[PDB]
Amino acid sequence: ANVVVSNPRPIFTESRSFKAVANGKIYIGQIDTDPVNPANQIPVYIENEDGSHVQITQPLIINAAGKIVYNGQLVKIVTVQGHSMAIYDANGSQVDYIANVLKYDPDQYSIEADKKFKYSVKLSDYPTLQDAASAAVDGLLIDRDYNFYGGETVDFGGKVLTIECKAKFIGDGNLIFTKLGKGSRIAGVFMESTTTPWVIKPWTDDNQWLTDAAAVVATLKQSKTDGYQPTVSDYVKFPGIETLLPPNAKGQNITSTLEIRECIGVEVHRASGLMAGFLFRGCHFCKMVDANNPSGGKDGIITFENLSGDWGKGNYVIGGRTSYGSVSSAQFLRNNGGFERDGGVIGFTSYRAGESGVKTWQGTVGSTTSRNYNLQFRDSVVIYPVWDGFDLGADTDMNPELDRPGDYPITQYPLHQLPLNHLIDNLLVRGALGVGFGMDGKGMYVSNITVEDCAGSGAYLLTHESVFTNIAIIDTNTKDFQANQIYISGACRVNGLRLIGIRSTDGQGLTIDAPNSTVSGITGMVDPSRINVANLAEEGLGNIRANSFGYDSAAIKLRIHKLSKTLDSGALYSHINGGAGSGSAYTQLTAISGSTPDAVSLKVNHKDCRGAEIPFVPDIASDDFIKDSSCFLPYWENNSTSLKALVKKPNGELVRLTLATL
Amino acid sequence: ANVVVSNPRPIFTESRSFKAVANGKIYIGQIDTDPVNPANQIPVYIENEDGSHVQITQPLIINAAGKIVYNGQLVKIVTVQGHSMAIYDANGSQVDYIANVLKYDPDQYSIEADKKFKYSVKLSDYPTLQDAASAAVDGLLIDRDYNFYGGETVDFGGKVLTIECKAKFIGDGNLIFTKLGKGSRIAGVFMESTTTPWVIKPWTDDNQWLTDAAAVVATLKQSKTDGYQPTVSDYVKFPGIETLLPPNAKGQNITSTLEIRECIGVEVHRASGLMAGFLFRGCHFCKMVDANNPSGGKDGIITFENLSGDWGKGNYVIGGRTSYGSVSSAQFLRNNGGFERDGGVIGFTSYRAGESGVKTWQGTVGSTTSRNYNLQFRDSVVIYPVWDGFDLGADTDMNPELDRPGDYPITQYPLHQLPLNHLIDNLLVRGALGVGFGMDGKGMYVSNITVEDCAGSGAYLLTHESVFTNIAIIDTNTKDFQANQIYISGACRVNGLRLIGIRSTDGQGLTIDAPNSTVSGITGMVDPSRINVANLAEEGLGNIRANSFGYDSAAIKLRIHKLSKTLDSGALYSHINGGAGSGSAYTQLTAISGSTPDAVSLKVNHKDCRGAEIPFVPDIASDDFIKDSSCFLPYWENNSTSLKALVKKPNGELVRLTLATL
Amino acid sequence: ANVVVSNPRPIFTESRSFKAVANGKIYIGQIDTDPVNPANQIPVYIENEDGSHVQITQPLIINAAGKIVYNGQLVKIVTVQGHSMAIYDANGSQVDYIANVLKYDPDQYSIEADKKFKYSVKLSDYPTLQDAASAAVDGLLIDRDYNFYGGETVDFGGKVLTIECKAKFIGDGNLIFTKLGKGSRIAGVFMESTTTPWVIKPWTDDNQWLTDAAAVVATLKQSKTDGYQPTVSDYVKFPGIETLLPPNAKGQNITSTLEIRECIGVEVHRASGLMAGFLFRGCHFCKMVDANNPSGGKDGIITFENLSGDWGKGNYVIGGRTSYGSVSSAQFLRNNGGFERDGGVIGFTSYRAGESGVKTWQGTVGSTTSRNYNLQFRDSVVIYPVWDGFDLGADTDMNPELDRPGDYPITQYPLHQLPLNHLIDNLLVRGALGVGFGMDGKGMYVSNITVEDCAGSGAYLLTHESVFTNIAIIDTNTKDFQANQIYISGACRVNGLRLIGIRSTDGQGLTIDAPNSTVSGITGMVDPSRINVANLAEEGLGNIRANSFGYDSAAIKLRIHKLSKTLDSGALYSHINGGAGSGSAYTQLTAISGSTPDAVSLKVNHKDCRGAEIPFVPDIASDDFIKDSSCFLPYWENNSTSLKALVKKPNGELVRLTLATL
């Protein structure tokens, strides 16, 4: 096509007559210079049958047939590209002084065009993608939908390519890119499944989920988007949705993925597709930049697998608008950030998600540890995940089997106590039907978080001696399913926690459940009955000022929480003494009595009385009712009608006196 | 010099004598092998003048002049790749054999340049932008500055072409990229305007706003930037500007718009300019990624108008940095993001927006409605707007009622009670001369807001049954014009709210005026004389410390807002029994009296007395002052000069009983 | 050794025999024509060795040997357009005739290729970067490792290029790009250093920072990553390094920054490079969106040296994940961003900053100011910076000798009083070994910060008259022995502070040390004996339920921080009676005496008696002990073995009355 079969051994003839210069001489030197000078002489190399290139002295001979002959026979001499010439015949005359042989090409426009135009092969001109890849030198360009061959391999000779995609990759397999340089920029990638699979739509037209098998089935239709494939979790939580699905629409693996195994820093930019997916394997410093709504399929839409080989330092998901799918939206296997928290999602957003919107695989795959450490999950978002929320936790394996094959053994770090030490901040969730988080770790910290309306638990934090700051769990668990709104199974210091919102628990389930954790700054109207924290204290409030709006009194009270859940304990209300629309009020220190609240009172300035209302024991009082020296207690006796008042002697003993006499 | 004359038809000769092969044979085959057995053979083609390549019977023939000959006439044979040549003479002896040879044909360079080069068209060599767009295939460049006339429609077609703009589209008219292809990109546009308009600069040279109507007129300067052209709204924000403002500055329309119609998603990266506009008429999935301070003109800087046809979803303003303009920046219009919140303002920074920061339009523009639903307004900023930092309002109108045509019958949803489902987070506002925040809707879950310094009302929320959180309203109404720093008309429920910073003011009206909401957790300082909520009760918190620094006494200070909300109801507050280190401090429980606080009180440990101090009625007590049983009311008898005790017998009848005697 | 030596001069031999075409003739004509016609003959030029193209007559001649000839001398005959050779022998006969020597018309095709391809010049073709820049119109590409000399000043002539870098850009010192056009898009640059310097790393394998000189010196090694070069300031963090540091590593100044001199809007893009750094000098409206872990050298990784000339508006640092360094990672020097807060930092992510993750070079350099106003720091994060975190101070710490040379006179704004109007929201730090969030200024409104674990200080604030919000300094000062967790010297106001996390304030000093601040609702488990603010008035709180979960009582431990800010000043306990669940508890109003908490208690309902146990002075009462105009004080009289009542008449005449005679 582009190679000529021509005279392989060159012919050098005499200029003034039609004869070859026997015992002639050829010198090769620098461009536009005398080549007779030994210094100007440039290397001139043989090419024997073994591919060697051995230098030889410059005065190359020309035999009596026009070819060039070494001390033996013909040889295929070789110089670099820019070789000058100087023919000298035996006698000493000259024949030629070709200055720059490269200027003698039959078409010397290419020598200039090649140097002032950008190189980019377009796939339309080629029959196979691999053939186009084998020709690209600067950047490929796709101008035609490619029907990829169910998992074909495409090795780009380890080049650096600024691939631009302007057409789909129709197919139902896994196009695999390999051996790309440390500059690749595959962008505009679009993968569409060649097969339209059966999908389910557990939600309805009013944002309200469905946890009923019959309704899920009735919402079973055939289309590439607006749904997802049934998966293991779907018949894990939905009650018996094995028995209501035809085999053909059950356990299929329709998907289209762009696997880029074994590459470093290929920088996948804007990506899209229907039933798409992007599975990086054995990558490092390989980030995926904002992707415009890749509707997922049966595989993780963005899976940063790094099982084999070293860990996965440097895998990012910066930006994104991922949607739908039947398995986790953004996954992470192995992928140790190794200090620097180099990796993890940033600015990500995952609608639907048939699993956690940003999940860090737990347990182990094969015999390889699949947890994720020193990562960074910050400034992200997730909305309406079905089976699991922003599941950060690693080693969340409920099933205990044995030591972890590949990382710290449970003898050193017991499960749910690994020092994976993530970095978290500015998160968000909305409408999650599973659990808002799945965190589990030891000695890590989290920052501003908010879990808005949800149909499941708002937090499942199986941590140990961690710190949670400014958490917000507003109006979560509207389905009433569980009773563990925000659950913490380990010592923790939640501060600035937000709980019940516009929706009212109305005695449903329970709110915060951290019997091993201490929480402070719990703000919001939550019925205190349903709180089970080991400790709780607002140690630091200044000189407070309680206010009451719409009420006729200010309810300042204590409500010992171990004595009785619903029942209180002590209070110092300030009810209006006697209406006095703008007159005054009375203050009373009410205390709970026989299974009743606010029985006794120390009313002060009742009904504008300007005097106290001290209580007294209605009957005889024992000797054990005083525990403090120099104290005065009134107890009444009806028979004599006089008010006795037993007084603990400051000396320490006790005497009984008569205070008021009729 | 473009082509150098050179003879085709290479000549083959012998190796030891100059004679030329006669009737010989040339056999081609794979590298470094015997090229005679079809096992090692490589195809060889004929490249006639027409370019029609054709195969040949393998054994090449050479006439008596050492030239490849086919069918008598000389022919140029072209192989497919590298090959080993074995030239045998008519006798059959090997004239010469070679294993490796390569000489790419110099002909057919256009065929090798149509493929390996990046197609585009520089506008410098085309008369009309439409003519340049017609010839473009997969790229384009604006080298020369264009001069589009008003309404110049440009036809690109399905061409998915990257318009990398390196020049500016000067013109006070509108440029339309009609029916441009899907997946395109536009970068670096620096749109401008031929006519410099008369602008105003309502902010003084140092800072802050000139609320005076006669102050702006001085700023009238006729500069292309540093001002927003006069607008209808300017005639109601500044009272009395109708008169002084000259007619030349009235009714200006100087703006330049890159109107786009009928596209299914085109990025507009780095869309710079001044006096610019970027309307997206009837467009879907188009996102104005990034920007560079386009000092917008009179029309909205980024207006995703869609009321022509379908609802429109996927329109983003992801990223960017906008400034100036007369009408709101980044205004949406009839975009229902769907369930997945596909349209939003994720990331933004607007400066001195003429009307509003992100105003989502309200009511109905023309017959078709002009509202929005299911959009995400996530992390962003709005600096020194004029009217609204974020007018995410829907069916507001304020005055107009009737019925919204095209959204929802007023019967199904009354005024301001629209289900919008906007998700909001990480907002910010500063120096908003008007309302710094405001919307309406039945059910919205707001999150972190952190408004700050403002010269106007902090917020004007008009929702109904919605929950807010981490709302930080700091130092608003710096000019005191409005009587409310926040006004939540509906029965909302705030969940943590900051109010004052340093601009504390006793000249402002009620800072918060939500008459039916239910706030919780008002942390910042505030004059409680200002709150007007329906129920201020944050229930749930631990043991309190009630600290007081550098101040004599520390207090709890209960206050009933039914009673002289300016005066406290009086409560428990310990004082000092001497200089520091005394170790004694008397807890002084109080209770308000007629329009005077702490007139009636009960003390304990008065300056180290180690004893209580019980108040008594100075005059005679009455039954009205008592009601609870088993309690006595010490009242003084001035006549007999002794402490009587009005005792309420447990039996239910009070018997006036003497207590003390002299 | 790539090409095969070959005779370039064309030798012509007749077709049907092996003879040269003696004294023949060549006609060069138009494409696809018969050149014998005198009209079908294009101009034909000689090319000399020197390169002096000259025209000659058409009917070319051939000497006796076949080579072309002109005046008894050989020549190379070239044309400006594709031709159609026609060779005729001396006798007269068409020995051969090529319709198309090249099969295209380069002259005509040159126009089409010029106007249908994307211009660019790969550096491989050019020797010097300056030469490539001169011979480029746009889309310049770097494809070979251009090892620039210590210095390289490149003048681009004002062209608006699109420079790109697919290969390393090695060198040393500081290369200089100059005269870039308004809109360049330098992307993918990758710098390095030709010298591997001796580096240190004060962090062990567990990130437990090092401070002893011996350890840090022991870890001194030679490499480009994993460490930083010592700086003069490094002699302060670790005392004694001046003596123990070997001379070789004592002050090595190595870096590979590219100095973009005077330029406008050269948006740099993804950048990397070991020991690389970058900086802009005298440059406006430029940004460095994104980055890929550029390890720094002796100079700030992203500096903005815009000191000479006018202030540097618009110098953003959007995005990026810089790492390491020895003097800074985002330092700015002189940038007044106007009222639009233009030219700040957004979406950054530092690491192991040698001095600060973000800096503003407070003080003065040369005879010029080095402060910077009206910037914009948001959505950033700096992890484990050594000397400081978000160092944002503008005024010098203690340099009153100068008066802000070229800046607001100290008289106009005293030390640490410059109105900077910075915009700081949504930040974070972690692991800082210095100060987390240092600051200086007046009248500024920082908010929403989440400082995290950091051995050192949580924040050193010198603001005066500033408002804060949502600040969260948690578990800071890990290494202990530091002055304060947070220090706010000024009349500031703070809102929403989080303090202590899961670490114990045992060996630390005052956690909050703002002697003249007015902090609001301080939340979290902080020891109220470690706070030293001037107020905590949080007035605005609602009804509250101070419920305790673990302990056996619920307390309102009212405190006075003037008597003693350690023990207490009176409580409102409510302990349970007869164990939990019995529905019995007694309220205990109390006070302090003898420097022992709970010395006196007026407890109600002790042991479920419905009584009113009251304390009294165990001796004669004193008129001073009573101050209320109407109140009786009980006092015991062991001599009378009875209680007496110190009674004060309403007018004020003291009276004595017995209470309980026996």
Side-chain angles (χ1 to χ4, degrees), chain A residues 218-283:
Chain A
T219 61
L220 186 149
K221 58 186 177 65
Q222 204 205 63
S223 167
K224 278 192 296 222
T225 195
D226 199 303
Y228 66 97
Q229 321 273 351
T231 188
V232 176
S233 76
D234 283 28
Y235 63 90
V236 173
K237 79 176 170 80
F238 293 79
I241 198 74
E242 292 293 328
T243 73
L244 309 199
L245 297 177
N248 75 49
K250 184 195 284 284
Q252 65 272 29
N253 196 327
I254 303 307
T255 182
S256 174
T257 70
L258 187 153
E259 178 171 356
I260 318 179
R261 52 188 279 273
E262 281 86 20
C263 65
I264 286 184
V266 289
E267 181 76 10
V268 186
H269 275 91
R270 322 171 300 278
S272 165
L274 284 74
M275 315 293 278
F278 307 77
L279 189 145
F280 308 84
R281 187 168 298 137
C283 290

Side-chain angles (χ1 to χ4, degrees), chain A residues 13 15 107 109 116 118 162 185 316 339 341 426 445 493 535 555 557-558 562 593 627-628 632 651, chain C residues 11 65 104 110 114 118 166 207 270 321 384 426 452 501 543 546 551-552 554 583 586 603 614 638:
Chain A
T13 63
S15 57
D107 166 37
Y109 191 88
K116 77 159 193 184
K118 197 175 201 97
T162 302
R185 191 147 291 169
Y316 278 98
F339 292 160
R341 290 95 182 102
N426 297 321
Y445 306 69
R493 301 296 196 87
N535 186 325
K557 67 183 80 173
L558 295 94
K562 70 189 283 284
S593 80
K627 67 176 183 176
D628 291 331
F632 158 76
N651 304 121
Chain C
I11 200 175
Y104 71 108
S110 184
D114 264 350
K118 165 74 165 171
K166 295 176 166 294
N207 284 57
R270 295 147 287 274
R321 211 221 76 82
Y384 305 93
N426 192 12
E452 186 64 27
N543 291 319
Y551 324 121
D552 211 41
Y586 72 86
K603 63 181 73 66
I614 284 179
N638 313 61

Side-chain angles (χ1 to χ4, degrees), chain A residues 599-660:
Chain A
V600 298
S601 63
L602 267 286
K603 294 132 91 163
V604 169
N605 185 8
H606 177 285
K607 193 65 67 63
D608 267 22
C609 182
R610 314 185 58 87
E613 206 260 348
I614 298 89
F616 54 86
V617 190
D619 60 353
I620 193 79
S622 63
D623 185 296
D624 69 343
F625 294 165
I626 307 290
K627 67 176 183 176
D628 291 331
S629 57
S630 68
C631 274
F632 158 76
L633 171 68
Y635 69 112
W636 200 38
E637 42 173 355
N638 195 0
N639 55 2
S640 185
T641 301
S642 295
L643 181 50
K644 279 179 162 306
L646 63 87
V647 61
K648 178 94 158 169
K649 281 284 303 317
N651 304 121
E653 69 256 38
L654 181 43
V655 298
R656 301 167 190 273
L657 320 183
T658 307
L659 190 72

Side-chain angles (χ1 to χ4, degrees), chain C residues 360-558:
Chain C
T360 58
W361 260 99
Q362 58 267 21
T364 189
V365 186
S367 66
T368 58
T369 298
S370 179
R371 284 53 166 270
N372 46 6
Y373 299 169
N374 303 336
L375 305 190
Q376 173 182 120
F377 302 76
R378 323 197 331 277
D379 290 8
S380 181
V381 65
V382 301
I383 49 174
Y384 305 93
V386 176
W387 199 71
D388 275 329
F390 277 74
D391 173 16
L392 294 169
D395 197 355
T396 169
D397 56 345
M398 297 296 303
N399 291 341
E401 57 277 5
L402 58 298
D403 295 0
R404 333 286 164 81
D407 194 9
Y408 295 139
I410 300 191
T411 302
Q412 179 185 3
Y413 296 112
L415 277 296
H416 309 95
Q417 298 283 326
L418 301 175
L420 318 185
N421 282 347
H422 280 92
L423 195 144
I424 304 104
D425 291 331
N426 192 12
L427 275 69
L428 187 141
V429 311
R430 204 180 200 282
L433 186 54
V435 176
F437 180 64
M439 185 180 288
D440 170 10
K442 177 183 87 179
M444 65 180 288
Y445 285 63
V446 62
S447 65
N448 189 358
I449 292 160
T450 303
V451 173
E452 186 64 27
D453 169 16
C454 57
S457 282
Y460 184 71
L461 282 70
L462 301 203
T463 66
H464 302 67
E465 303 167 346
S466 295
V467 178
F468 305 71
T469 295
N470 284 341
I471 289 174
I473 62 171
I474 62 170
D475 284 321
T476 187
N477 201 349
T478 300
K479 265 191 165 298
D480 217 341
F481 70 76
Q482 313 304 20
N484 290 318
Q485 280 203 350
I486 183 168
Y487 188 85
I488 301 164
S489 47
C492 302
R493 294 238 183 109
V494 175
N495 288 1
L497 190 89
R498 304 292 161 191
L499 282 202
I500 306 315
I502 199 147
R503 188 169 178 79
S504 297
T505 326
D506 54 340
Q508 295 177 358
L510 287 165
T511 188
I512 285 275
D513 194 34
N516 36 11
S517 165
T518 305
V519 174
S520 81
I522 201 173
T523 62
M525 288 301 308
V526 54
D527 172 2
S529 315
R530 310 299 197 88
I531 305 191
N532 189 358
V533 303
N535 211 343
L536 283 86
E538 52 86 30
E539 45 182 8
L541 188 63
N543 291 319
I544 62 171
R545 208 154 292 113
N547 46 8
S548 54
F549 289 77
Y551 324 121
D552 211 41
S553 72
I556 311 294
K557 282 180 278 186
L558 166 61

